[PDB]
Amino acid sequence: HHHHHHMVHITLDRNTANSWLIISKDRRQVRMGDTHQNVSDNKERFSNYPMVLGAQRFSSGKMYWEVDVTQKEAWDLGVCRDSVQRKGQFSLSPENGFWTIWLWQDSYEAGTSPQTTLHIQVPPCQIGIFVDYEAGVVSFYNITDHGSLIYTFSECVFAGPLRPFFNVGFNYSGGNAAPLKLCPL
Ligand SMILES: Cc1cc(N2CCCCC2)nc(CO)n1
């Protein structure tokens, strides 16, 4: 891919974060805390899962960013509608306004309904996420493996403004405490 030149500076939106998340001062890193992080509840916060949005909203153009997933056991990454449900239980699917991939239990899957098995030869330490709003495309790249394609969602029905989407995952095992980090351009 030659997509790096649509590079955007993503920051995390503290107001949207699950109340157990800890976002760094520079708003570029997020991890699961071992407890509630002493913030007020609000209608934006994801209640059921360790999720947070980027502050940026996109309704046109091409956008690219990279995320560090080093030493994590579980995570979700991609984009979502600004209007996605925040409270209660829901599945990550394009019908619910999410275009995502994830890791759990040593398998990588795309968030279709039902989910799609991914074939990755080199487990990624950094993921590139490319959005072409006009084309209706969300693509994922393996930065650890020379930028090799992971998955492409096409004919996407964005149906509104998009936000970068993150899930640091639970840490039941004690092996998933590491942060997600937005990587420098
Ligand atoms: C804990 C878990 C894992 C899982 N997978 C998806 C298929 C590939 C393997 C991982 N699915 C579920 C569904 O409740 N739970």
From Swiss-Prot:
Subcellular location: Cytoplasm; Cytoplasmic vesicle, Autophagosome; Nucleus; Cytoplasm, P-body
Span of domain B30.2/SPRY: 8-185
Post-translational modification note: Autoubiquitinated; does not lead to its proteasomal degradation. Deubiquitinated by USP4; leading to its stabilization. Autoubiquitinated.
Swiss-Prot/TrEMBL induction comment: Up-regulated by IFN.
Membrane-spanning segments: none
Subunit structure: Homotrimer. Component of a SCF(SKP2)-like complex containing CUL1, SKP1, TRIM21 and SKP2. Interacts with CALR, CUL1, FBXW11, HSPA5, IKBKB, IRF3, SKP1 and VCP. Interacts with SKP2; the interaction with SKP2 does not depend on an intact F-box domain. Interacts (via N-terminus and C-terminus) with DCP2 (via N-terminus and C-terminus). Interacts (via C-terminus) with IRF8 (via C-terminus). Interacts with ULK1, BECN1 and with ATG8 family members, including GABARAP, GABARAPL1, GABARAPL2 and MAP1LC3C/LC3C. Interacts with TRIM21 and SQSTM1/sequestosome 1. Interacts with IRF3.
Entry's free-text remark on domains: The coiled-coil is necessary for the cytoplasmic localization.
Annotated function: E3 ubiquitin-protein ligase whose activity is dependent on E2 enzymes, UBE2D1, UBE2D2, UBE2E1 and UBE2E2. Forms a ubiquitin ligase complex in cooperation with the E2 UBE2D2 that is used not only for the ubiquitination of USP4 and IKBKB but also for its self-ubiquitination. Component of cullin-RING-based SCF (SKP1-CUL1-F-box protein) E3 ubiquitin-protein ligase complexes such as SCF(SKP2)-like complexes. A TRIM21-containing SCF(SKP2)-like complex is shown to mediate ubiquitination of CDKN1B ('Thr-187' phosphorylated-form), thereby promoting its degradation by the proteasome.
Family named by the database record: Belongs to the TRIM/RBCC family.
Name of the protein described by the UniProt record: E3 ubiquitin-protein ligase TRIM21
Protein species of origin: Mus musculus
Lineage: Eukaryota, Metazoa, Chordata, Craniata, Vertebrata
Gene that produces this protein: Trim21
